[PDB]
């Protein structure tokens, strides 16, 4: 129950990421619940101000949380943001780790759009995973948001749109379960890698798990390499067996993209939209979790 800025009241922790913690808050002046990220000012490597800059750069985008205030109060750097709802991982667990094809396709449509939006602002996300997509609350309850720009980086110059150079010999950045094959090989991430990751997320929602989950290793680095080997040895047609061909076509498309290629986001959305229509589904935003009694 601390005052933050002029008009924000801090409540209980709702989340922790790589740095700081996320608290329920109230905007006392507006009568609105918010999320408040705190980062201890005495950290050697401050990151919250950089994250707030990236969120500010993303403002106006559908499914980008609004940043309401940034500052520093007592022991903390402070970022106040729109309060969002549960993650897609949370909702997956709530739905007994089964999504209907309709729900997967409703999500795919928005998630491709969110990634395209981030790319349009000269960034790649590099941490595409079900934990980093949150449904909105209230009037925004049908909207998928993307969060966690802790690994986000410019893939091109904001002036010239000059693409970052090709590099190899990288250590893995991001989440091993959903990382692109290029990422596992130590190649620089680009737009294609966020989309390939989304393709693994979509097949994750379809299957309940990916075939490279639960691989035993002595060390993290060895585990990344076992996941790498399993991904590279699992044909897309085997990963996607018993599911609509569109999931395989999507992953084949992303795996074919050149390092500096602009993805055809419209093609990828239309792939799922055509499937959605062939199934006779409506874009009515009735997700599986909306049916929980």
């Amino acid at each position: 129950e601390l005052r933050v800025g002029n008009r924000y009241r801090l409540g209980r922790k709702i989340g922790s990421g790589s740095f700081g913690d996320i608290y329920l808050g109230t905007d006392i002046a507006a009568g609105e619940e918010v999320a408040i990220k705190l980062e201890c000012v005495k950290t050697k490597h401050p990151q919250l101000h950089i994250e707030s800059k990236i969120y500010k750069m993303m403002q106006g985008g559908v499914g980008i949380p609004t940043i309401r205030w940034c500052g520093a109060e007592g022991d903390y750097n402070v970022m106040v943001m729109e309060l969002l709802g549960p993650s897609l991982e949370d909702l997956f667990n709530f739905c007994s780790r089964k999504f209907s094809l309709k729900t997967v396709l409703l999500l795919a449509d928005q998630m491709i759009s969110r990634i395209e939006y981030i790319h349009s602002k000269n960034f790649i996300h590099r941490d595409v995973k079900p934990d980093n997509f949150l449904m909105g609350l209230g009037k925004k309850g049908n909207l998928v948001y993307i969060i966690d720009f802790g690994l986000a980086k410019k893939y091109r110059d904001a002036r010239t749109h000059q693409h970052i150079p090709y590099r190899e010999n990288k250590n893995l950045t991001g989440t091993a379960r959903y990382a692109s094959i290029n990422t596992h090989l130590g190649i620089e991430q680009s737009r294609r890698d966020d989309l390939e990751s989304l393709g693994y997320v979509l097949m994750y929602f379809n299957l309940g798990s990916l075939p490279w989950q639960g691989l035993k290793a002595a060390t993290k680095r060895q585990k990344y390499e076992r996941i790498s080997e399993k991904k590279m040895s699992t044909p897309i047609e085997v990963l996607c067996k018993g599911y609509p061909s569109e999931f395989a076509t999507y992953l084949n498309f992303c795996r074919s993209l050149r390092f500096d290629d602009k993805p055809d986001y419209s093609y990828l959305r239309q792939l799922f939209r055509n499937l959605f229509h062939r199934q006779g589904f409506s874009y009515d935003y009735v997700f599986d979790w909306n049916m929980l009694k």
Binding site: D131, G150, L172, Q213, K220
Partner: peptide, 10 residues
Amino acid sequence: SSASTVSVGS
């Protein structure tokens, strides 16, 4: 498991 689901890097 944390090793496969925890993001790494900065």
